[PDB]
């Protein structure tokens, strides 16, 4: 009886990304998983870090520094409700899935802001406990990414360069940094070129992988 | 009589980042440059792409697709005022400076959202004209980044890996993609460990580089 969290970053319910979230949620429930969601757009999630992330009086309001202030707020329990609610989803989660379209070679701003506001010090990382020693080391995370471009465009010979180098600041810099055992990215290329029956098989293949996602071998980080 | 645009992504006017923007603006004006700013936080810039980026009736409102809809809106002149105002700053700019603290190994969400909402198709790139053939090929861009970590942490032997690999999706994936001649990043490491007199020299060295920034040799992209 494991618990999964699906973070979705797409504005449209009619999108293929939304379809992929639905497929993920259905396959996991069918396998006994408990499924919680963070549809950032449906939540109208605020992705901008500010002093309003901390309730009540600050330590140094004249010279506000987000890192020091936010960590203190997490420890003492003075973070804003929307952040706290998200941190609670993560605390309960065994597996976290990030479903998003690749945007300017990375995560959409609303997901980037989610990381910035939710992954507070002490909670998601400490200067003393990161990577293998990270707080999330008992959890697994996976990116499911849809692109406009082709797999070959995102290779060494392609115009964009290798995808693994592109995803490094997310997979390593964010996920592994916080301790996550990162699983292999689900990459869906050339969305606009994919006919209807192929898109269906894409959804079916994704649900198929999720049937045994937990048994997978994580990525290796030196 | 050249024109410069400074995009700043920091909430605090008391921040060292704000100080660096002020230093940049002052050194360029002293050298005859015209200086325009985009203080994203002071502007309360909206960093979330949505159908509200397009005014009036859409082509396909039942199945909204941002890329197709936004490009059409740029061509026909139906983009939201805040986006248009930003695109006009870029059109007039010879040099664009991005001043921001490194956040989770990249740009803050509000700057990421700025790229996503402002860099619309046809305006900032086309599938047929990118990189060297990009629309911004007559312009130069530079990142000025402040970090909590050290230069050595961001090396091959460091725990975080090489900085140039970290900055690749920004420098290449965004700036060069749109045609910019990208200049060498101004990297200010270990902010929290830097004493007052050293911070002053940091500001002075930055203004010094800007005295002859336009004559610099751009980065090489294969
Ligand atoms: C700001 C921005 C930056 C971008 N940057 C990049 C980049 O750097 N690199 C890159 O490669 N691409 C980039 N893109 C392109 C982007 O990655 C693709 O547009 C995106 O991945 C497509 O995903 P989608 O969910 O919007 O597909 P949609 O266009 O919403 O859907 C595609 C098809 O799937 C169908 N569909 C929906 N639901 C179902 C279902 N249940 N079953 C079967 N079919 C269904 C739809 O009807 C549609 O025909 C960018 C786009 C934007 C807006
Ligand atoms: C969400 C988030 C994610 C982050 N991710 C990363 C990461 O991945 N890697 C990493 O290395 N770091 C990271 N950091 C740390 C961050 O990069 C640093 O906190 C930031 O670069 C410091 O910049 P600042 O402008 O806030 O400095 P501040 O702390 O605001 O200023 C530092 C000093 O400069 C002084 N100062 C201000 N104005 C002047 C002036 N005119 N003259 C002289 N001195 C002045 C101030 O008084 C202060 O003492 C992250 C921080 C956050 C909040
Ligand atoms: O769909 C494509 O068509 C192409 C045809 C010829 C050469 C290259 C490309 C591409 O890069 C991709 C995706 C293309 C991309 O990779 O970068 C982007 C940045 C912002 C917004 C949208 C996108 C894309 O859809
Ligand atoms: O200041 C630091 O102290 C350290 C001491 C020992 C080992 C590593 C580090 C660091 O990574 C940096 C910066 C540190 C970092 O690199 O990643 C972050 C992610 C989110 C928020 C803030 C930060 C940081 O300030």
Numbering used by the authors:
A (entry chain A), B (entry chain A): 3 to 224
Copied sentences from the primary study:
NAD(P)H:quinone oxidoreductase 1 (NQO1; EC 1.6.99.2) is a dimeric (61.7 kDa) human cytosolic FAD-dependent enzyme catalyzing the two-electron reduction of intracellular quinones to hydroquinones. NQO1 is an essential component of the antioxidant defense system, preventing the formation of potentially harmful semiquinone radicals. A frequent single-nucleotide polymorphism (SNP) in the NQO1 gene (on human chromosome 16q22.1), whereby C609 is changed to T, results in the replacement of Pro187 by serine in the protein. Overall, our structural and biochemical experiments reveal that the proline to serine replacement disrupts the interaction of the core with the C-terminus, resulting in a disordered tertiary structure that ultimately leads to greatly diminished enzymatic activity.
